[model samples]
Structure formats: C-alpha cells, structure tokens
Target: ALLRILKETEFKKIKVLGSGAFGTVYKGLWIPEGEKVKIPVAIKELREATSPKANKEILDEAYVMASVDNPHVCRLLGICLTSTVQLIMQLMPFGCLLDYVREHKDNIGSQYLLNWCVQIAKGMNYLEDRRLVHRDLAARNVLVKTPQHVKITDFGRAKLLGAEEKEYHAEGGKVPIKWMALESILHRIYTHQSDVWSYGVTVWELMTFGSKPYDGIPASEISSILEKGERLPQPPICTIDVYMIMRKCWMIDADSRPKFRELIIEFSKMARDPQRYLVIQGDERMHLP
Candidate 1:
C-alpha cells in the first residue's frame, strides 16, 4: 500500500492530544493550498530517538491505517517525514470515548450508550471480516467522531492473523493484564476472541462512566480471579441485556464468546429499541418471566 507523505509546512500543531508507549499525538490543522478554512487532523509524532524495531512498528501501523477503509475506523490522512516521523489522521472532534462517557454520562440517554457499543462492535466486525485483530480494543482507543458516533483508532498493535491459525504468540512485551483473556495471559495467545474480552471491559468502562476495571484489585490478582470465574460486576447504568452480553464475552473458553459480528447484530437490536428488550431497573426478580 502507498502512503501519502505530506510536507511539514502543510500542517501546524494546535494542541497535544495525548501520549502513550508509541508516541505523542497532537491536534493539528491541515492547510490546503490558498484555502482559508484549515482542516483539522490528529498527528502522532514518532520520535527520532525511537529504536529500529519501533521504527518498523510505526511503518507497519502506517500501512495498516492506510489499508483500512471503514467508516467506524479512523482514516489515515497522510504522513509527514522530518526529523521525526508524523502520522496524520482524521481528527475526532469530540475526543476519545473514555473521556466523553465520563463527562457526558449524566446528560446522555441510555440509547446513545447502546449506540456507542454497537458502533465499536461494528468497527471490530469490519476488522475481523478482514482477518485483522485490534490487539488494543478498548474505550481509550475508541475516538468519538460525533455525539453518539465513535471510530476505532490506534492500529499500532493490530495484526493480520494467519490462515488456519487461531492465535498469535509473542515472547516479551507489555500487555494490558486487566483486559486480556486467560489464554492470552497464560500462553500469549492472541485472537479476535481476546479482542472480544477487551471489548467487554471497554463496555464496562462506558457503562460505568470510565470506572477502572477490577477496582481496588491489583493487576497480579486479576488472573487468579478470572481462573475462579469471577468477572466484572454490572455497572449501575448498564441494562440487563448489555450486562448479559458482557458476561458472554468473559467466557473462559474462547469458542463460547460471540464474534464481533454477533455483537453488532445483538447490540443493534437493543440500541434501536432498548426499552422493548432491556430490563432497566432494580433486579426485583418480580420482573422474571
């Protein structure tokens, strides 16, 4: 795939978006030739001091970003090569899903929350259909494009799984222990199912307005708890139907978890007519059929 490299003078940094293991992301303005209206963009700076391996990872990520052509996935605008490599991507004006849920939870309706779930699932389904696994599928990695719309971002950890291969293994690297499935934690096994597990945690975060997963429990303790079949408790705002779906994603057996496409189907139904299918209040058991 060809990457469109842009001139450094074409875009100006507006503000810092955020920073992570990969690099620092900035909100930027893309200046069109002689145009008054400057288009907004998200620019990630790959530092000059980065190792050769890191350089390769950035290039791999750039290729993946350029290849993706889905509405729910963030689009790569172009790249700027200078003292430090810069990755230019479509700007998500509303910022990341994590912060959006935190700041807007009180005002946003339940249906909107469900819609966000559906969007994430839809995006993941798109990637899964293409045999790609978003190793970092989480709320923090989901950017809000509009009020109730989100797009999956951060393709740095994404991989195209091999044919006839169910899992990809890595020797040594940092992993999100809380969001990882048991198989991934034990055997470094990565699959779409592992992404599903992370998605479940992301859902928990959204429903709880950005509550930290396994609150008060150390990361080291999470594995033991999972071995005992303990999963995250339902958030107060989460409807029974949504909670049930999350539980399914937590299944120890990867085969038991529903695929992203299945989640898109299920979430779409609930999101469209939440009241009809959801049990939205206290569990009195009086509502039990």
Candidate 2:
C-alpha cells in the first residue's frame, strides 16, 4: 500500500528533538481526520536540498518504509510534502536502545538483553525476508518501546534489492567501519549477511550495557585489526553461548555466518532459560564456532 500525503496544517510541532546529518525531528501532535484524539507523532523535517537528486532519495525511502508493517520495525505514518518533504513517524518516547540500557544499567537483567537479541533478530528477519539491506544496524539505530520491545530505525543507509540481485556494492560515501563486516569494509559489498555481522556487534552492545564497539581501537586500524583475526572481547557478563553467536557472525567467510532466521533460533533457545544466562562466569570463555 502507498503512504498517505499528509497536510502540514494538521501537525503542530511540540518540541525540537535534536538534528542530525539527515535533518531535525520534532515531537508533534498530528490531527487525524475526524478523530477526536490527537495522535502524537514524530515530524521528520528534511533539510532543504539544492538538487532534485538529493530530494528524490528521501521519497523513495519513504515509500519503502511505508510499505513495511512489521511490529518490530518503527512505522512511517505518512508524508507531508506541502512546503518541504516531512515524514510522519511513530514517536519513540523511549528513544535509543543503547541509552535506555545504560540508563537502567543497575536495575536491568540479562533477560532483557536476551529479549533484545531475539527481538532485533526478528526485526531483521522480517527485513531480510523482504530483500531489505539495512546497511546500518547498530544499537544506536534501535529504539525501545518497552523493556521487552524494541524496533529497528535509521534507514538512511538502507537499500532495496532487485529480485535478481545477489549483493549490493557501496554508494561511494562514509560507511560504518566499526559495525561493518570485513567484506563490506574492504570490497564495498553489502548484503543481509553483512548486516548479520553488524547485528553481532549490536548484541555485543546490549551484553556490555551499550559500551562502544572496538573500544580504544582507532578506526584507521580496524581493517588491519580485523585482518589479524581479532574481534571484540567478550563482555564481562556475556554468556558463552551468546559469545559463540558473536563469533559465528565475525567469521572471515561471510557465507559461514548464520542468517537472521537461524539467529532467532539460537537466541530464542537461550532466552527461554534466562536464569542460565543471567549470571555468567568471567572465566567460562568461548571458542570459535
């Protein structure tokens, strides 16, 4: 289904939520037609583009995002293109998953971490099934609706694949070297398989309560470090089973890594026995998958 073309007059910006390279988002109240209740929404105001090329990209992405109806994915309500192109999105009150974890660090449990693992896996599972490659998949791109519920966001780096496409190459811009897989970093190749690699790093973030990836390792040295077969160290409280999943993701052979489908299987199994993974011993290190 196509997205609705919303009128700008119906939306009232409540507060400015900071701006990024993309644009500024605002907490807003959207007056839906004939509805008594005013729905709170996020108004994504794009920066004025000098070129039609830059302006066209957002609309295409808006259509792609609008077609998506997964519960684990944040929704694109509609588009406001009257004066400028504005995207009406679901307001994620809880904000970034990384920030949520750290804010509740002492009170949170391992089960939430496990839940996040599977929830994100399910979200990506939906995207992978639809031939969507979310080039940027990290904890920062994840948003929390509730402790057990999180949704994937930030589709600025996303790409829609052709039915006959096997893998997509780079678009000649900055890529997330830290979260990227080896094939992506070196060869500029992108696929759901590489997203699996980024997913592993995201899982690492939750396991470590949102610690930065490749801590102390400079970006310039990541390619060299990865070439030397080094990966992020296991989080202090990370279970051996979970660490194994991370290892499988970091394998040099991208084909050797599990898909988001299989990843749900592994994470679901661990999530069932939350007690078993809640308190991990520091010495029970894991080996390669």
Candidate 3:
C-alpha cells in the first residue's frame, strides 16, 4: 500500500502547491481502486521525460523516500510512470514551515516553536539511526503538518549510506552552499555531522521565524567566513539556552558536532518547561517595531 505503481487515471490533479526546475508539485486527489472517497495527495511531476538516465534517477530517489516510515517523515504514496514520472506523496496541508512561520509568527508561541524544533530533532535522529543523511535540512525543507506537528521532507538531497559507510562525497554538484557545512563546502563531503550543522541552521530559522540565514552575506565569501568561525547571530527570540544548543550544532570541527540523537534529548529536556526558554519576560504583550 505504501509503494504502488499507481495509474495516472487513479489520480486527479488539483492546483499547484509548488514548482521548481525539477517540475511542478500539485495538490491532487487519489481515488483508490474500489474506494469511493478521494484521498488528498501531493503529486510531484517532472516537467520532461528526457532520458532513461533522468528516468531511473528519479525512480531511484522515490525508492529511497519510500524506505522511510516515520510520523515526522513525509510518506511516499506511489508513482505515475505511465506518462511523465510523477511521484505521489502525502500532502502536508499546512504547506512548508518557512511560509507558515513567517505568516503567523506572532500567533505561534515560543513553546509551540519548541515543539516543532523537538519534532525535527526527533525526525533527524530517526534518519541518523537509519544511516540516512538529509544533506538539505532547512526551514524550507520542513513541511507543516499541523499547528503542533511538522515533518522532514524534500529528499532531493538525501543519501542512504552503506552499512559501514560514514560519509558521502560528491564530485562537484550544485550543493546548497548556504546551508552546507565547512567540510561539505571544501570537500564536497556529506556526513551525519554535516547534517547537524544544517540542522542548526534550520532550527535557527524556526527561532527567527524563518529569517534568511546569513541574509546579506555574499555566497562566494561564505567558505572563508565560515572557516573564520563566523556564524548566524543568536536569534532575537532565542533564550541563551536555546541559542547555545543551536550553536553547538555548528562546531567548526565536524567530529565535535553533537549527533541528532543527543540534540533530541536536550531539546526534549528544554521542552519540558517551555516557559524557561522564552527570553522576553512577560512579553506576550510585545509588539513588532
């Protein structure tokens, strides 16, 4: 039921949720065989059916996504290969975390943000346990399932390592330099440690209500700046404890970075008394400048 070669006719495209160079993602309804009610799903459509290379590459990606089964991880429903290769995916009705946080940042309390942060840590911990590295962890990559829940998604940059493998090296591809770690930028290497750095950046977005990381910094100079130990400043809403936790994820040495599992425990502990993580005192009455 999780992975099926669904027919194109079984699905009806609704409206677009998002689109990119890859293709368009649409909100769709999947009518299962013998099922009367339509199921809401997100259809990932590749714009072109170019070649077998492009074809299998996407199919391979889909299988990797399908392998993961977690509440905090997006589920792969099926595929549509009869026509253009379209991936059927679970629809996160609330959209991505970035837009949702930005649109309703005020309404969402710090404690609620902590919950999201915990959810992401838990999900990444799961991926870590499975020896999977989500090289592209970021606010934009996380989908909002509900006001209280979120899911790690966008596996376009995910990789499954061999049983004994600890790191993966790419021979120069279009990597997201902004979200990448120093080791990744210099060596084209991705590891669970590198993912921790990216996770820090993602949590920074949650705390900052999705502010652009390194906002005005020139991309070309990012490597040197990071090598020089510069990092995103503590988010305004972050208490010293929360900021400290995030900063630990950005340790200059990859081996020094805390694993996602450790981060889960710490964040879970922090979530125990969310009020303590609120920096602004009695500021439910605070206003924007």
For every model shown, what is its TM-score relative to the native structure?
0.88, 0.92, 0.92
**Candidate 2, clashing residue pairs?**
none
lDDT of 1: 0.82
Q: Whole-model lDDT for model 3 versus the true structure?
A: 0.84
Model 1, range 55-106, lDDT digits (tens) per residue?
Answer: 5676776776688878899988788766788888989998888888787655
The list of candidate 1 runs beyond 4 A from truth reads 32-37, 53-61, 277-289
**Candidate 2: tens digits of C-alpha lDDT, residues 1-289:** 5676677677888999878777888999999766677988888887776764444666787787899878788889888776677888888888889998788776667667788899999999999988989999999899877766899986467878999997989867777899999989989999999999999999998888889998788887898999999999988787687788899999989999999999999889988887586574432242211
Candidate 2 steric clashes: 0
Query: What are the Cα lDDT values of the candidates?
Result: 0.82, 0.84, 0.84
Please list the residue runs of candidate 3 whose C-alpha ends up more than 4 Å from where it truly belongs after superposition. 53-61, 280-289
Q: Alpha carbon lDDT of residue 19, candidate 1?
A: 84
- Residue-level lDDT of model 3, residues 193-216, one tens digit each, is 999999999999888888998888
Select the stronger candidate by TM-score from 1 and 2: 2
Lowest lDDT sum, 10 consecutive residues, model 3, at 280-289
